């Protein structure tokens, strides 16, 4: 599923222009009544949808994710999400939600219909193929939704980790076996990684890692216990960090060696694109309170698709003995 997983990585920094044009455009970042996060969050998945299908036909039906693809305006009505194919019809589509807003209509389906041309070469030297009837996908258009919004562009790293700001923000596609429930793939977006403090362009970072049949190939990762919780976390060296798929991205990265999490708000598109990555590193992800009675967590089957009972992100087997043992 090599050709498919290069593919998720052209989508998903597609995904992130969307993030960083609705940011830094100046009539998208002005924007029950008009919710344009929502907006933001259902068009991104729309387009990752549309995009597969539209190169693996039938996969646009296996295609599913934390957003609908249904929106209700101001006036009432409920408005199905189909874009294209042409520019001009996405614009009428979008001003019936934006109750006539063409300035910013427009700019959303320029940066929608926008060419992108995103290839790691090291994947075009892998070829692996996965049957297309094996494959599910959980899509996360834009993880760290608060974090987003408020868009504090100043934080400084504590140890590497960022407690908050627009670092905590990913783009997560994930894929898994529909037969078995075991994650295959994964594509993690950071589209806010680093800014120029005079010309204020945000430049983003994609993160991928196949593990199939054995085969366990990842992205390079850049060089440089510790355990990363999230800010609501209350369960007894450790870390706060906004975002579900960021502190799964920081035990990736080797910033932190466990991220724990202890209620069930967390869900499959949240976990999914990280497990997937992890696995090709060795790792995975543990149900919390299964472990407190290594069970890792599946994808096919509902309970709906949130992991109750927690979980436990690990890059180590070895660590995370290490950290059962302490707690
Ligand atoms: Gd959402
Ligand atoms: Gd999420």
Known sequence: ????????????????????????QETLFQLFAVDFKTLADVLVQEVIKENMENKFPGLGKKIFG?????????????????????????????????????????????VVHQDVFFSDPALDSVEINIPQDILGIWVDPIDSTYQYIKGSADITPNQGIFPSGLQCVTVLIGVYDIQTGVPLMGVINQP??????????????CYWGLSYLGTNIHSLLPPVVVI?????????????????????????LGLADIYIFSEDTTFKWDSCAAHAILRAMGGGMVDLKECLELPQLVYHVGNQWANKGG?????????????????
């Open 192 to 205: 806010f990684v680093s800014q120029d403090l005079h010309t204020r362009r945000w430049k983003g970072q």
């Open 1 to 24: 599923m090599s050709d498919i997983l290069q593919e998720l990585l052209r989508v998903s920094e597609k995904a992130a222009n969307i993030a960083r044009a609705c940011r830094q």
């Open 66 to 110: 934390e957003e609908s693809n249904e929106l209700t305006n101001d006036l009432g009505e409920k408005i199905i999400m189909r874009l294209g194919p042409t520019e001009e019809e996405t614009v009428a589509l979008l001003s019936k939600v934006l109750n006539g807003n063409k300035l910013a209509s427009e700019a959303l389906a320029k």
């Open 228 to 252: 990363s919780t999230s800010e609501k976390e209350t369960i007894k060296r450790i870390f706060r960090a906004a975002g579900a798929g960021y502190k799964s991205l920081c035990v990736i």
């Open 311 to 327: 979980l436990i992100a690990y890059r180590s087997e070895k660590q995370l003995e290490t950290f059962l043992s302490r707690l």
